[PDB]
């Protein structure tokens, strides 16, 4: 069947400043089928309070979802998004870079 | 408002 691997962007809702509450987003898009595992990580560990948007899709029928959680960015804490999908041999981890 | 009853294919 049709299998499309997810695109991933990891980013903050607002320009990141250390010490100021923000939202960490992982936007997964372009994938099919819709079953997907997405976790937000803080220093490698799964963040427990993570919400996601209602599943929708694009003109080519590929799906997209936003996963998000409140976070307070700091200088030393590392954040990332971990995605697994039928198209991926192993989970893909994308690190948050405040410049992108 | 939703369409009332799209039919089965």
């Amino acid at each position: 069947m049709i299998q499309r691997t997810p695109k991933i962007q990891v980013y903050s809702r607002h320009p990141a400043e250390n010490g100021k509450s923000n939202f960490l987003n992982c936007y997964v898009s372009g994938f099919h089928p819709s079953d997907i595992e997405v976790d937000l990580l803080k220093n490698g560990e799964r963040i427990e309070k993570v919400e996601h948007s209602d599943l929708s899709f694009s003109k080519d029928w590929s799906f997209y979802l936003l996963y998000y959680t409140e976070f307070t960015p700091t200088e030393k804490d590392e954040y990332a998004c971990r995605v697994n999908h039928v198209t991926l041999s192993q989970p893909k981890i994308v690190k948050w870079d405040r410049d992108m | 408002t939703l369409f009332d009853e799209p039919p089965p294919l």
Binding site: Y11, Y27, P33, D54, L55, F57, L66 | T1
Partner: protein
């Protein structure tokens, strides 16, 4: 400007046990305003925008009835299609449906549409004339024959040109404070040295609505796509959108490069340069 109302539906079969997962979302332009999730506790259509919450109980009862009817239609369809394509009962499959209507700046009907997909590929779609069907293969041709005999396009056309547009206009008025407001992109440029002789310039567009936007780089007044990167427009999570475009340039030559931003909220396009 122009406006749209669109509904999106996804059903995913669960062969090991139970009924398909069903998720429905309704949008006006780029604003989600209702949702139904078969896994959620309410088993009701739920509001997702403040301006829809004022609708009365008759509305929520009726939208719940209809969205559950949609879910059962998809459930039946997944069975029908498994048989059409001679597929095993052990695999998970997906149906997707999107329909809606557009109006112009005068809020008069512009176009309507209804598209259906199986396992991520076109299955059947209403033509732009709202009278006939586009069938992608011979299984969908079977469906087309059935729907022609049952006057399906007529009923759908009447909704797309009547009810759909009439309720879109209702929503546009009730939610005018946001739905009829454009949020121009907040724009700025960042600079990221790559070496002693090269740097990335990144042009940012933030907090804009609706999502449609164009970001273009120019060098000495002509478009440049070589050595550029343009990310997919992405949701901020507060109802607005974000995008950036980047170009790699020789260090010291940044003044040749301009980023150009086009958006419905901008009377004139914006030009940004690194100072």
């Amino acid at each position: 400007g122009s406006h749209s109302m669109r509904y999106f539906f996804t059903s995913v079969s669960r062969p090991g046990r139970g009924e398909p997962r069903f998720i429905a979302v309704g949008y006006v332009d780029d604003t989600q305003f209702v949702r139904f999730d078969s896994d959620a506790a309410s088993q009701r259509m739920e509001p997702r925008a403040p301006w829809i919450e004022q609708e009365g109980p008759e509305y929520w009862d009726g939208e719940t009835r209809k969205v559950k009817a949609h879910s059962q239609t998809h459930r039946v369809d997944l069975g029908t299609l498994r048989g059409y394509y001679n597929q095993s009962e052990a695999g998970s499959h997906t149906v997707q449906r999107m329909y809606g209507c557009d109006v112009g700046s005068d809020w008069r009907f512009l176009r309507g549409y209804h598209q259906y997909a199986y396992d991520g590929k076109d299955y059947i779609a209403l033509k732009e004339d709202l009278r006939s069907w586009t069938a992608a293969d011979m299984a969908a041709q079977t469906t087309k024959h059935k729907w022609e005999a049952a006057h399906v396009a007529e009923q759908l056309r009447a909704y797309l040109e009547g009810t759909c547009v009439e309720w879109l206009r209702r929503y546009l008025e009730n939610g005018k404070e946001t739905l009829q407001r454009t949020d121009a992109p907040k724009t700025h440029m960042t600079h990221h040295a790559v070496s002693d002789h090269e740097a990335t310039l990144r042009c940012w567009a933030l907090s804009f609505y609706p999502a449609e936007i164009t970001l273009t780089w120019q060098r000495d007044g002509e478009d440049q796509t070589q050595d550029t990167e343009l990310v997919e427009t992405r949701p901020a999570g507060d109802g607005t959108f974000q995008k950036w475009a980047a170009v790699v340039v020789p260090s010291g030559q940044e003044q040749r490069y301009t980023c150009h931003v086009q958006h419905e909220g901008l009377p004139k396009p914006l030009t940004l340069r690194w100072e």
